[PDB]
From a paper:
To establish how the C-terminal Tryptophan/Threonine-rich domain of [name] mediates reticulocyte binding we used X-ray crystallography to experimentally determine the structure of this domain. The structure was refined to 1.45 Å resolution and had one molecule in the asymmetric unit. Consistent with the NetSurfP predictions, the structure is composed primarily of α-helices that are arranged into an extended three-helical bundle with small helical domains at each end. The conserved tryptophan residues that define the domain are distributed along the length of the helical bundle and are all buried within the fold, contributing to the arrangement of the long helices. Since experimental determination of this structure, new methods for prediction of 3D protein structures have been accelerated through use of deep-learning strategies as exemplified by AlphaFold2 (AF2). AF2 predictions of the [name] Tryptophan/Threonine-rich domain structure closely resemble the structure we experimentally determined, with an RMSD of 1.56 Å over 213 Cα atoms. Analysis of the surface charge of the [name] revealed extended positively charged patches, mainly on the N- terminal and concave side of the protein surface, similar to the shape and surface charge of BAR domains, suggesting a potential lipid binding function. [name] CTD showed specific and strong binding to sulfatide, an anionic glycosphingolipid found on the outer leaflet of multiple cell types, including red blood cells. [name] binding to sulfatide followed a sigmoidal binding curve, suggesting a saturable and hence specific interaction.
Numbering used by the authors: 460 to 691
């Protein structure tokens, strides 16, 4: 039925609407990312409260290499050696736990956002490829050499095949260029807000660790660890 020029214009209008629809998708993604980051504020605050409470005790059902490394000296260490340990190895363990918490959240974020983009791109592509006249011409020309060549000699190509191949080639190139202009937002993406959030939380929580360590020392909290482990 329809001419090659009509089919070109149908693609042009479809790409315009796709760019418009992308703006709504991107706004929804940004809103979801911002709300996710807000919820990490709450989760990090809860995480710190739980970690601090865990450092108050060393019950016999706990397996912890850091606490064992200190407690194998618990018969011989004076106060100054407990203080030196918590300020060096104690803080190093708290910093390592926070580092892996942040890496875990970064891993989830990248997988979640990248998969939403993969899904959206494909939903878009399926919408175009399943258009009735588009699916029809693609089935006609992709699978049969009968529709490509004028006769069994397989020399001269049919005019309509050439029109289809040239049109679909250029539209695939346009689509690929459009996708590559947006892909960096979701794939291997550097989210500056998350990077600044990580650096700010590391600095704040490092000082929170030091404040907690000072209280642990002032309360001689290792005496509770010893009693938890059976000591008198």
């Amino acid at each position: 039925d329809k001419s090659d020029e009509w089919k070109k214009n149908e693609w042009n209008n479809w790409l315009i609407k796709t760019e418009e629809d992308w703006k709504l998708f991107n706004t929804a993604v940004e809103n979801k990312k911002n709300r996710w980051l807000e919820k990490r504020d709450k989760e990090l605050e809860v995480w710190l409260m739980n970690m601090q409470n865990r450092w108050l005790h060393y019950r016999e059902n706990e397996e912890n290499e850091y606490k064992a490394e200190a407690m194998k000296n618990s018969a011989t260490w004076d106060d100054s050696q407990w203080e030196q340990w918590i300020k060096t190895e104690g803080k190093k363990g708290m910093e390592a736990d926070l580092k892996k918490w942040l890496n875990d959240k970064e891993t989830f974020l990248d997988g979640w956002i990248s998969k939403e983009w993969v899904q959206w791109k494909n939903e878009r592509m399926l919408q175009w490829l399943s258009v009735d006249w588009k699916h029809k011409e693609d089935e006609t020309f992709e699978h049969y050499k009968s529709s490509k060549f004028t006769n069994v000699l397989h020399i001269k190509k049919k005019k309509k095949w050439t029109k289809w191949k040239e049109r679909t080639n250029k539209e695939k190139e346009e689509w690929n260029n459009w996708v590559k202009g947006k892909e960096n937002l979701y794939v291997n993406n550097k989210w500056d807000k998350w990077l600044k959030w990580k650096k700010d939380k590391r600095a704040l929580y490092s000082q929170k660790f030091l404040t907690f360590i000072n209280k642990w020392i002032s309360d001689k909290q290792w005496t509770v660890w010893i009693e938890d482990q059976g000591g008198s």
